[PDB]
Design a protein around this ligand. Structure first.
Ligand SMILES: CCNCCc1ccc(CN(CC)c2cc(OC)ccc2[C@@H]2CCc3cc(O)ccc3C2)cc1
Ligand SMILES: CCNCCc1ccc(CN(CC)c2cc(OC)ccc2[C@@H]2CCc3cc(O)ccc3C2)cc1
Lengths: 234, 234
Protein backbone atom coordinates (compact mmCIF):
# COMPACT_ATOMS: atom_id res chain seq x y z
CA UNK A 1 0.00 0.00 0.00
CA UNK A 2 1.03 3.60 -0.59
CA UNK A 3 0.94 6.02 2.33
CA UNK A 4 -2.17 7.71 0.92
CA UNK A 5 -3.84 4.29 0.56
CA UNK A 6 -2.79 3.30 4.08
CA UNK A 7 -4.46 6.47 5.38
CA UNK A 8 -7.57 5.82 3.29
CA UNK A 9 -7.78 2.25 4.59
CA UNK A 10 -7.51 3.41 8.21
CA UNK A 11 -10.10 6.18 7.84
CA UNK A 12 -12.62 3.86 6.20
CA UNK A 13 -11.99 1.26 8.94
CA UNK A 14 -12.93 3.70 11.71
CA UNK A 15 -15.56 2.44 14.16
CA UNK A 16 -18.73 4.43 14.79
CA UNK A 17 -19.35 6.59 17.84
CA UNK A 18 -21.82 4.70 20.04
CA UNK A 19 -24.37 6.16 22.42
CA UNK A 20 -24.88 5.42 26.08
CA UNK A 21 -27.97 3.36 26.92
CA UNK A 22 -30.03 5.32 29.41
CA UNK A 23 -33.57 6.64 29.27
CA UNK A 24 -32.97 10.39 28.73
CA UNK A 25 -36.40 11.03 30.27
CA UNK A 26 -35.21 9.49 33.57
CA UNK A 27 -33.05 11.02 36.36
CA UNK A 28 -25.20 4.19 37.65
CA UNK A 29 -21.92 5.55 36.27
CA UNK A 30 -19.88 2.32 36.33
CA UNK A 31 -22.79 0.50 34.69
CA UNK A 32 -23.12 3.03 31.86
CA UNK A 33 -19.38 2.96 31.21
CA UNK A 34 -19.34 -0.85 31.33
CA UNK A 35 -22.19 -1.21 28.84
CA UNK A 36 -20.68 1.36 26.48
CA UNK A 37 -17.20 -0.16 26.47
CA UNK A 38 -18.62 -3.65 25.94
CA UNK A 39 -20.56 -2.53 22.89
CA UNK A 40 -17.48 -0.69 21.59
CA UNK A 41 -15.35 -3.83 21.89
CA UNK A 42 -17.37 -5.69 19.25
CA UNK A 43 -16.71 -2.84 16.82
CA UNK A 44 -13.03 -2.81 17.86
CA UNK A 45 -12.69 -6.39 16.60
CA UNK A 46 -14.13 -5.38 13.24
CA UNK A 47 -11.76 -2.40 13.07
CA UNK A 48 -8.66 -4.38 14.07
CA UNK A 49 -9.30 -6.93 11.32
CA UNK A 50 -9.11 -4.02 8.84
CA UNK A 51 -5.80 -2.64 10.12
CA UNK A 52 -3.48 -3.56 7.23
CA UNK A 53 -1.28 -6.50 8.16
CA UNK A 54 -3.24 -7.46 11.28
CA UNK A 55 -5.11 -10.41 9.73
CA UNK A 56 -1.85 -11.80 8.35
CA UNK A 57 -0.91 -12.73 11.93
CA UNK A 58 -1.94 -15.96 13.56
CA UNK A 59 -5.26 -15.84 15.33
CA UNK A 60 -3.42 -16.59 18.59
CA UNK A 61 -1.19 -13.53 18.08
CA UNK A 62 -4.15 -11.39 17.03
CA UNK A 63 -5.85 -12.22 20.32
CA UNK A 64 -2.69 -11.44 22.34
CA UNK A 65 -2.42 -8.00 20.74
CA UNK A 66 -6.07 -7.15 21.38
CA UNK A 67 -5.90 -8.48 24.94
CA UNK A 68 -3.03 -6.11 25.71
CA UNK A 69 -4.34 -3.11 23.77
CA UNK A 70 -8.14 -3.00 24.05
CA UNK A 71 -8.32 -0.51 26.94
CA UNK A 72 -5.61 1.69 25.39
CA UNK A 73 -7.64 1.77 22.17
CA UNK A 74 -10.84 2.68 24.04
CA UNK A 75 -9.05 5.49 25.86
CA UNK A 76 -7.32 7.05 22.85
CA UNK A 77 -10.71 7.01 21.13
CA UNK A 78 -12.25 8.76 24.14
CA UNK A 79 -9.47 11.34 24.22
CA UNK A 80 -9.85 12.01 20.50
CA UNK A 81 -13.65 12.37 20.84
CA UNK A 82 -13.21 14.75 23.81
CA UNK A 83 -10.57 16.94 22.12
CA UNK A 84 -12.91 19.74 21.09
CA UNK A 85 -14.67 19.78 24.50
CA UNK A 86 -12.30 21.35 27.05
CA UNK A 87 -12.65 20.00 30.57
CA UNK A 88 -15.09 17.25 29.56
CA UNK A 89 -14.88 13.65 28.40
CA UNK A 90 -17.24 12.70 25.56
CA UNK A 91 -17.81 9.07 26.47
CA UNK A 92 -20.76 9.33 24.08
CA UNK A 93 -22.69 12.23 22.49
CA UNK A 94 -25.31 11.76 25.25
CA UNK A 95 -22.77 11.22 28.05
CA UNK A 96 -20.46 14.25 28.24
CA UNK A 97 -18.99 14.28 31.74
CA UNK A 98 -16.79 16.65 33.74
CA UNK A 99 -14.31 15.79 36.48
CA UNK A 100 -16.80 16.74 39.20
CA UNK A 101 -19.18 14.04 37.94
CA UNK A 102 -16.40 11.49 38.44
CA UNK A 103 -16.12 12.14 42.18
CA UNK A 104 -19.05 9.77 42.79
CA UNK A 105 -16.81 6.69 42.25
CA UNK A 106 -13.61 6.01 44.18
CA UNK A 107 -10.61 6.20 41.86
CA UNK A 108 -12.57 7.77 39.00
CA UNK A 109 -11.53 11.43 39.19
CA UNK A 110 -7.87 10.37 39.07
CA UNK A 111 -8.44 8.52 35.79
CA UNK A 112 -10.67 11.30 34.46
CA UNK A 113 -7.90 13.80 35.22
CA UNK A 114 -5.32 11.91 33.17
CA UNK A 115 -7.73 11.51 30.25
CA UNK A 116 -8.53 15.22 30.40
CA UNK A 117 -4.81 16.04 30.44
CA UNK A 118 -4.23 13.87 27.36
CA UNK A 119 -7.16 15.45 25.52
CA UNK A 120 -5.82 18.94 26.24
CA UNK A 121 -2.43 17.78 24.91
CA UNK A 122 -4.10 16.50 21.72
CA UNK A 123 -5.77 19.90 21.37
CA UNK A 124 -2.58 21.94 21.78
CA UNK A 125 -0.79 19.79 19.20
CA UNK A 126 -3.86 20.13 16.93
CA UNK A 127 -3.89 16.37 16.33
CA UNK A 128 -5.27 15.48 12.90
CA UNK A 129 -7.69 12.65 12.21
CA UNK A 130 -5.17 11.02 9.88
CA UNK A 131 -2.52 11.06 12.61
CA UNK A 132 -5.03 9.72 15.15
CA UNK A 133 -5.86 6.63 13.09
CA UNK A 134 -2.14 5.94 12.62
CA UNK A 135 -1.53 6.20 16.37
CA UNK A 136 -4.42 3.86 17.14
CA UNK A 137 -3.07 1.26 14.72
CA UNK A 138 0.37 1.63 16.32
CA UNK A 139 -1.15 0.86 19.73
CA UNK A 140 -2.77 -2.31 18.40
CA UNK A 141 0.47 -3.63 16.87
CA UNK A 142 2.88 -2.47 19.59
CA UNK A 143 1.29 -2.93 23.00
CA UNK A 144 1.50 -6.72 23.09
CA UNK A 145 4.54 -7.50 20.94
CA UNK A 146 6.66 -7.97 24.08
CA UNK A 147 4.71 -10.89 25.54
CA UNK A 148 4.70 -13.38 22.64
CA UNK A 149 9.61 -20.45 17.70
CA UNK A 150 10.34 -19.97 14.00
CA UNK A 151 6.73 -18.86 13.51
CA UNK A 152 6.89 -16.32 16.34
CA UNK A 153 10.06 -14.83 14.87
CA UNK A 154 8.23 -14.36 11.56
CA UNK A 155 5.21 -12.84 13.29
CA UNK A 156 7.38 -10.30 15.10
CA UNK A 157 9.28 -9.43 11.93
CA UNK A 158 5.97 -8.75 10.16
CA UNK A 159 4.66 -6.57 13.01
CA UNK A 160 7.80 -4.43 12.95
CA UNK A 161 7.53 -4.12 9.17
CA UNK A 162 3.95 -2.89 9.49
CA UNK A 163 4.92 -0.52 12.30
CA UNK A 164 7.70 0.89 10.11
CA UNK A 165 5.14 1.37 7.33
CA UNK A 166 2.92 3.32 9.74
CA UNK A 167 5.88 5.51 10.72
CA UNK A 168 6.47 6.26 7.04
CA UNK A 169 2.78 7.15 6.73
CA UNK A 170 2.90 9.61 9.64
CA UNK A 171 5.97 11.27 8.17
CA UNK A 172 4.28 11.42 4.76
CA UNK A 173 1.22 13.11 6.27
CA UNK A 174 3.53 15.63 7.90
CA UNK A 175 5.54 16.29 4.74
CA UNK A 176 2.35 16.79 2.72
CA UNK A 177 1.21 19.41 5.24
CA UNK A 178 4.40 21.41 4.64
CA UNK A 179 6.39 20.67 7.79
CA UNK A 180 10.16 20.86 7.60
CA UNK A 181 12.17 17.69 8.08
CA UNK A 182 13.01 18.89 11.59
CA UNK A 183 9.35 19.59 12.38
CA UNK A 184 8.54 16.11 11.03
CA UNK A 185 10.74 14.13 13.39
CA UNK A 186 9.92 16.46 16.29
CA UNK A 187 6.19 15.92 15.73
CA UNK A 188 6.57 12.16 15.23
CA UNK A 189 8.40 11.99 18.56
CA UNK A 190 5.81 14.12 20.36
CA UNK A 191 2.99 11.90 19.13
CA UNK A 192 4.71 8.65 20.05
CA UNK A 193 5.63 9.91 23.51
CA UNK A 194 1.90 10.45 24.10
CA UNK A 195 1.47 6.69 23.65
CA UNK A 196 3.50 6.13 26.83
CA UNK A 197 0.91 8.15 28.74
CA UNK A 198 -1.90 6.17 27.11
CA UNK A 199 -0.19 2.99 28.28
CA UNK A 200 0.01 4.54 31.75
CA UNK A 201 -3.71 5.34 31.89
CA UNK A 202 -4.53 1.85 30.62
CA UNK A 203 -2.51 0.19 33.36
CA UNK A 204 -4.23 2.31 36.00
CA UNK A 205 -7.56 1.42 34.41
CA UNK A 206 -6.72 -2.29 34.34
CA UNK A 207 -5.90 -2.05 38.06
CA UNK A 208 -9.38 -0.70 38.68
CA UNK A 209 -11.10 -3.43 36.66
CA UNK A 210 -9.20 -6.23 38.39
CA UNK A 211 -10.09 -4.72 41.77
CA UNK A 212 -13.78 -4.90 40.82
CA UNK A 213 -13.53 -8.72 41.04
CA UNK A 214 -16.23 -9.23 38.40
CA UNK A 215 -16.07 -12.36 36.25
CA UNK A 216 -16.65 -10.80 32.83
CA UNK A 217 -15.52 -7.20 33.14
CA UNK A 218 -11.99 -7.93 31.82
CA UNK A 219 -12.40 -9.76 28.48
CA UNK A 220 -10.95 -13.23 28.62
CA UNK A 221 -8.52 -14.58 26.05
CA UNK A 222 -11.19 -17.16 25.22
CA UNK A 223 -13.85 -14.48 24.76
CA UNK A 224 -11.53 -12.40 22.57
CA UNK A 225 -10.65 -15.52 20.58
CA UNK A 226 -14.35 -16.35 20.14
CA UNK A 227 -14.93 -12.80 18.87
CA UNK A 228 -11.92 -12.78 16.53
CA UNK A 229 -12.17 -16.39 15.28
CA UNK A 230 -15.01 -15.70 12.88
CA UNK A 231 -16.30 -18.04 10.22
CA UNK A 232 -16.69 -17.25 6.51
CA UNK A 233 -20.40 -18.13 6.35
CA UNK A 234 -21.69 -14.58 5.78
CA UNK B 1 24.06 23.15 23.16
CA UNK B 2 24.94 21.41 19.91
CA UNK B 3 23.83 17.81 19.42
CA UNK B 4 27.40 16.58 19.90
CA UNK B 5 27.64 18.60 23.13
CA UNK B 6 24.26 17.33 24.31
CA UNK B 7 25.52 13.77 23.81
CA UNK B 8 28.79 14.57 25.59
CA UNK B 9 26.89 16.09 28.52
CA UNK B 10 24.67 13.01 28.85
CA UNK B 11 27.53 10.53 28.65
CA UNK B 12 29.57 12.37 31.28
CA UNK B 13 26.46 12.55 33.52
CA UNK B 14 26.02 8.77 33.52
CA UNK B 15 25.72 7.18 36.97
CA UNK B 16 28.05 4.37 38.02
CA UNK B 17 27.13 0.70 38.10
CA UNK B 18 26.68 -0.25 41.75
CA UNK B 19 27.26 -3.62 43.34
CA UNK B 20 24.90 -5.67 45.46
CA UNK B 21 25.73 -5.81 49.17
CA UNK B 22 26.07 -9.45 50.14
CA UNK B 23 28.95 -11.42 51.61
CA UNK B 24 30.13 -13.43 48.57
CA UNK B 25 31.59 -15.99 50.99
CA UNK B 26 28.08 -16.71 52.36
CA UNK B 27 25.27 -18.87 50.88
CA UNK B 28 16.95 -12.50 50.53
CA UNK B 29 16.13 -11.45 46.95
CA UNK B 30 13.68 -8.62 47.71
CA UNK B 31 16.14 -7.26 50.28
CA UNK B 32 19.07 -7.25 47.86
CA UNK B 33 16.99 -5.56 45.16
CA UNK B 34 15.65 -3.02 47.67
CA UNK B 35 19.10 -2.06 48.95
CA UNK B 36 20.52 -1.80 45.43
CA UNK B 37 17.71 0.38 44.08
CA UNK B 38 17.88 2.65 47.12
CA UNK B 39 21.58 3.25 46.63
CA UNK B 40 21.00 3.84 42.90
CA UNK B 41 18.36 6.49 43.64
CA UNK B 42 20.88 8.82 45.28
CA UNK B 43 22.99 8.68 42.12
CA UNK B 44 19.85 9.18 40.00
CA UNK B 45 19.31 12.55 41.67
CA UNK B 46 22.85 13.59 40.80
CA UNK B 47 22.35 12.43 37.20
CA UNK B 48 18.97 14.14 36.76
CA UNK B 49 20.42 17.47 37.89
CA UNK B 50 22.90 17.17 35.00
CA UNK B 51 20.28 16.46 32.33
CA UNK B 52 20.37 19.73 30.36
CA UNK B 53 17.34 21.85 31.12
CA UNK B 54 16.23 19.83 34.16
CA UNK B 55 17.55 22.26 36.80
CA UNK B 56 15.86 25.17 35.04
CA UNK B 57 12.53 23.76 36.27
CA UNK B 58 11.07 24.58 39.64
CA UNK B 59 12.13 22.26 42.41
CA UNK B 60 8.48 21.24 42.81
CA UNK B 61 8.33 20.20 39.14
CA UNK B 62 11.70 18.46 39.35
CA UNK B 63 10.36 16.33 42.19
CA UNK B 64 7.16 15.50 40.27
CA UNK B 65 9.15 14.29 37.28
CA UNK B 66 11.44 12.10 39.40
CA UNK B 67 8.51 10.74 41.40
CA UNK B 68 6.84 9.55 38.19
CA UNK B 69 10.00 8.34 36.43
CA UNK B 70 12.38 6.85 39.01
CA UNK B 71 11.36 3.20 38.51
CA UNK B 72 11.31 3.58 34.72
CA UNK B 73 14.85 4.98 34.90
CA UNK B 74 16.02 2.10 37.11
CA UNK B 75 14.52 -0.44 34.70
CA UNK B 76 15.90 1.02 31.47
CA UNK B 77 19.29 1.08 33.17
CA UNK B 78 18.87 -2.59 34.12
CA UNK B 79 17.80 -3.50 30.59
CA UNK B 80 20.77 -1.66 29.11
CA UNK B 81 23.20 -3.35 31.54
CA UNK B 82 21.68 -6.78 30.73
CA UNK B 83 21.76 -6.32 26.93
CA UNK B 84 24.92 -8.31 26.32
CA UNK B 85 23.82 -11.15 28.67
CA UNK B 86 21.04 -13.12 26.94
CA UNK B 87 18.47 -14.61 29.29
CA UNK B 88 19.88 -12.86 32.37
CA UNK B 89 19.35 -9.58 34.18
CA UNK B 90 22.52 -7.83 35.39
CA UNK B 91 21.11 -6.13 38.46
CA UNK B 92 24.77 -5.70 39.44
CA UNK B 93 28.06 -7.28 38.28
CA UNK B 94 27.81 -9.61 41.31
CA UNK B 95 24.06 -10.24 40.94
CA UNK B 96 23.38 -11.69 37.47
CA UNK B 97 20.06 -13.52 37.70
CA UNK B 98 18.01 -15.73 35.37
CA UNK B 99 14.25 -16.12 35.23
CA UNK B 100 14.39 -19.36 37.23
CA UNK B 101 15.94 -17.47 40.15
CA UNK B 102 12.93 -15.15 40.13
CA UNK B 103 10.44 -17.95 40.82
CA UNK B 104 11.21 -17.68 44.56
CA UNK B 105 9.09 -14.49 44.87
CA UNK B 106 5.44 -14.25 43.84
CA UNK B 107 5.05 -11.89 40.89
CA UNK B 108 8.79 -11.72 40.19
CA UNK B 109 9.16 -14.01 37.16
CA UNK B 110 6.45 -12.03 35.36
CA UNK B 111 8.43 -8.80 35.80
CA UNK B 112 11.72 -10.56 35.01
CA UNK B 113 10.17 -11.86 31.79
CA UNK B 114 9.21 -8.39 30.57
CA UNK B 115 12.65 -6.99 31.42
CA UNK B 116 14.29 -9.89 29.59
CA UNK B 117 12.06 -9.27 26.57
CA UNK B 118 13.02 -5.59 26.52
CA UNK B 119 16.73 -6.42 26.81
CA UNK B 120 16.48 -8.83 23.89
CA UNK B 121 14.74 -6.07 21.90
CA UNK B 122 17.57 -3.65 22.74
CA UNK B 123 20.03 -6.29 21.52
CA UNK B 124 18.29 -6.92 18.18
CA UNK B 125 18.13 -3.18 17.49
CA UNK B 126 21.80 -2.93 18.53
CA UNK B 127 21.01 0.03 20.80
CA UNK B 128 23.94 2.42 21.10
CA UNK B 129 25.10 4.02 24.33
CA UNK B 130 24.46 7.48 22.89
CA UNK B 131 20.87 6.53 22.04
CA UNK B 132 20.40 4.97 25.49
CA UNK B 133 21.34 8.16 27.35
CA UNK B 134 18.95 10.15 25.14
CA UNK B 135 16.11 7.72 25.87
CA UNK B 136 16.76 7.88 29.61
CA UNK B 137 16.64 11.68 29.55
CA UNK B 138 13.39 11.50 27.56
CA UNK B 139 11.86 9.29 30.28
CA UNK B 140 12.81 11.81 32.97
CA UNK B 141 11.25 14.76 31.12
CA UNK B 142 8.20 12.97 29.71
CA UNK B 143 6.82 10.54 32.27
CA UNK B 144 5.38 13.15 34.64
CA UNK B 145 4.55 16.08 32.35
CA UNK B 146 0.87 15.03 32.34
CA UNK B 147 0.25 15.44 36.07
CA UNK B 148 1.39 19.03 36.68
CA UNK B 149 -0.86 28.70 36.27
CA UNK B 150 1.29 31.02 34.17
CA UNK B 151 4.39 29.41 35.70
CA UNK B 152 3.21 25.87 34.92
CA UNK B 153 2.56 26.85 31.31
CA UNK B 154 6.15 28.09 31.07
CA UNK B 155 7.51 24.94 32.71
CA UNK B 156 5.66 22.73 30.23
CA UNK B 157 6.81 24.82 27.27
CA UNK B 158 10.42 24.44 28.43
CA UNK B 159 10.09 20.66 28.88
CA UNK B 160 8.73 20.25 25.35
CA UNK B 161 11.55 22.42 24.02
CA UNK B 162 14.12 20.21 25.72
CA UNK B 163 12.36 17.07 24.51
CA UNK B 164 12.44 18.44 20.95
CA UNK B 165 16.16 19.09 21.39
CA UNK B 166 16.65 15.46 22.45
CA UNK B 167 14.73 14.29 19.37
CA UNK B 168 17.06 16.37 17.19
CA UNK B 169 20.02 14.77 18.98
CA UNK B 170 18.78 11.22 18.31
CA UNK B 171 18.26 12.04 14.65
CA UNK B 172 21.72 13.63 14.49
CA UNK B 173 23.30 10.49 15.97
CA UNK B 174 21.48 8.45 13.35
CA UNK B 175 22.48 10.71 10.45
CA UNK B 176 26.12 10.66 11.57
CA UNK B 177 26.04 6.85 11.50
CA UNK B 178 24.97 6.91 7.84
CA UNK B 179 21.29 6.00 8.09
CA UNK B 180 18.97 7.21 5.38
CA UNK B 181 16.28 9.73 6.27
CA UNK B 182 13.74 6.89 6.15
CA UNK B 183 15.88 4.70 8.42
CA UNK B 184 16.20 7.70 10.76
CA UNK B 185 12.51 8.23 11.42
CA UNK B 186 11.87 4.47 11.45
CA UNK B 187 14.55 4.00 14.12
CA UNK B 188 13.42 7.02 16.14
CA UNK B 189 9.90 5.55 16.20
CA UNK B 190 11.12 2.07 17.17
CA UNK B 191 13.10 3.48 20.08
CA UNK B 192 10.28 5.67 21.37
CA UNK B 193 7.75 2.84 21.14
CA UNK B 194 10.02 0.88 23.50
CA UNK B 195 9.38 3.60 26.09
CA UNK B 196 5.71 2.57 26.21
CA UNK B 197 6.82 -0.90 27.29
CA UNK B 198 9.14 0.60 29.90
CA UNK B 199 6.18 2.57 31.24
CA UNK B 200 4.22 -0.69 31.31
CA UNK B 201 6.87 -2.54 33.33
CA UNK B 202 7.14 0.41 35.72
CA UNK B 203 3.41 0.41 36.41
CA UNK B 204 3.47 -3.32 37.10
CA UNK B 205 6.47 -2.76 39.37
CA UNK B 206 4.75 0.10 41.20
CA UNK B 207 1.79 -2.23 41.79
CA UNK B 208 4.13 -4.69 43.47
CA UNK B 209 5.74 -2.06 45.69
CA UNK B 210 2.41 -0.66 46.86
CA UNK B 211 1.22 -4.19 47.65
CA UNK B 212 4.26 -4.64 49.91
CA UNK B 213 2.71 -2.10 52.31
CA UNK B 214 6.11 -0.89 53.54
CA UNK B 215 6.43 2.70 54.73
CA UNK B 216 9.62 3.68 52.89
CA UNK B 217 9.83 1.39 49.89
CA UNK B 218 8.13 3.88 47.54
CA UNK B 219 10.05 7.19 47.84
CA UNK B 220 7.86 9.95 49.18
CA UNK B 221 7.52 13.33 47.53
CA UNK B 222 9.03 14.77 50.72
CA UNK B 223 11.98 12.38 50.59
CA UNK B 224 12.57 13.14 46.91
CA UNK B 225 12.31 16.86 47.66
CA UNK B 226 14.80 16.52 50.53
CA UNK B 227 17.19 14.73 48.15
CA UNK B 228 16.76 17.22 45.30
CA UNK B 229 16.60 20.43 47.39
CA UNK B 230 20.32 20.60 48.01
CA UNK B 231 22.21 23.52 49.47
CA UNK B 232 25.22 25.27 47.91
CA UNK B 233 27.51 24.78 50.92
CA UNK B 234 29.90 22.30 49.27
C1 LIG C 1 -14.59 -4.42 26.97
C2 LIG C 1 -14.48 -5.41 28.12
N1 LIG C 1 -15.41 -5.09 29.19
C3 LIG C 1 -15.24 -3.69 29.53
C4 LIG C 1 -15.92 -3.39 30.87
C5 LIG C 1 -15.54 -2.00 31.40
C6 LIG C 1 -14.77 -1.09 30.67
C7 LIG C 1 -14.49 0.15 31.25
C8 LIG C 1 -14.96 0.43 32.51
C9 LIG C 1 -14.72 1.77 33.23
N2 LIG C 1 -13.33 2.12 33.50
C10 LIG C 1 -12.25 1.13 33.55
C11 LIG C 1 -10.90 1.76 33.25
C12 LIG C 1 -13.10 3.52 33.85
C13 LIG C 1 -13.11 3.80 35.21
C14 LIG C 1 -12.90 5.12 35.64
O1 LIG C 1 -12.91 5.40 37.01
C15 LIG C 1 -12.70 4.28 37.83
C16 LIG C 1 -12.71 6.14 34.71
C17 LIG C 1 -12.71 5.85 33.35
C18 LIG C 1 -12.91 4.54 32.91
C19 LIG C 1 -12.90 4.24 31.39
C20 LIG C 1 -12.13 5.32 30.66
C21 LIG C 1 -11.97 4.98 29.20
C22 LIG C 1 -13.31 4.57 28.55
C23 LIG C 1 -13.43 4.63 27.11
C24 LIG C 1 -14.64 4.27 26.49
O2 LIG C 1 -14.75 4.30 25.07
C25 LIG C 1 -15.74 3.87 27.28
C26 LIG C 1 -15.63 3.82 28.68
C27 LIG C 1 -14.39 4.19 29.31
C28 LIG C 1 -14.33 4.13 30.86
C29 LIG C 1 -15.72 -0.50 33.22
C30 LIG C 1 -16.00 -1.71 32.64
C1 LIG D 1 14.26 3.81 45.29
C2 LIG D 1 13.09 3.77 46.26
N1 LIG D 1 13.09 2.55 47.05
C3 LIG D 1 13.20 1.43 46.15
C4 LIG D 1 12.85 0.13 46.87
C5 LIG D 1 12.70 -1.04 45.90
C6 LIG D 1 12.97 -0.94 44.53
C7 LIG D 1 12.80 -2.08 43.74
C8 LIG D 1 12.35 -3.24 44.31
C9 LIG D 1 12.15 -4.55 43.52
N2 LIG D 1 11.15 -4.52 42.46
C10 LIG D 1 10.08 -3.53 42.40
C11 LIG D 1 9.58 -3.32 40.97
C12 LIG D 1 11.22 -5.63 41.51
C13 LIG D 1 10.41 -6.71 41.81
C14 LIG D 1 10.41 -7.82 40.96
O1 LIG D 1 9.58 -8.91 41.26
C15 LIG D 1 8.53 -8.62 42.14
C16 LIG D 1 11.24 -7.85 39.84
C17 LIG D 1 12.05 -6.76 39.55
C18 LIG D 1 12.06 -5.65 40.39
C19 LIG D 1 12.97 -4.45 40.04
C20 LIG D 1 13.29 -4.46 38.56
C21 LIG D 1 14.06 -3.22 38.17
C22 LIG D 1 15.26 -2.95 39.11
C23 LIG D 1 16.33 -2.09 38.65
C24 LIG D 1 17.43 -1.83 39.48
O2 LIG D 1 18.47 -0.96 39.03
C25 LIG D 1 17.50 -2.43 40.75
C26 LIG D 1 16.47 -3.27 41.20
C27 LIG D 1 15.34 -3.54 40.35
C28 LIG D 1 14.24 -4.49 40.89
C29 LIG D 1 12.09 -3.31 45.67
C30 LIG D 1 12.26 -2.20 46.45
Amino acid sequence: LTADQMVSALLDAEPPILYSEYDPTRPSMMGLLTNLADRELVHMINWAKRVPGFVDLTLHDQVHLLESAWLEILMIGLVWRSMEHPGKLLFAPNLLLDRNQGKSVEGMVEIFDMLLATSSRFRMMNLQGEEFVCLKSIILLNSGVYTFTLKSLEEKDHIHRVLDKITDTLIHLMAKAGLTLQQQHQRLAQLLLILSHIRHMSNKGMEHLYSMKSKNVVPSYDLLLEMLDAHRLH
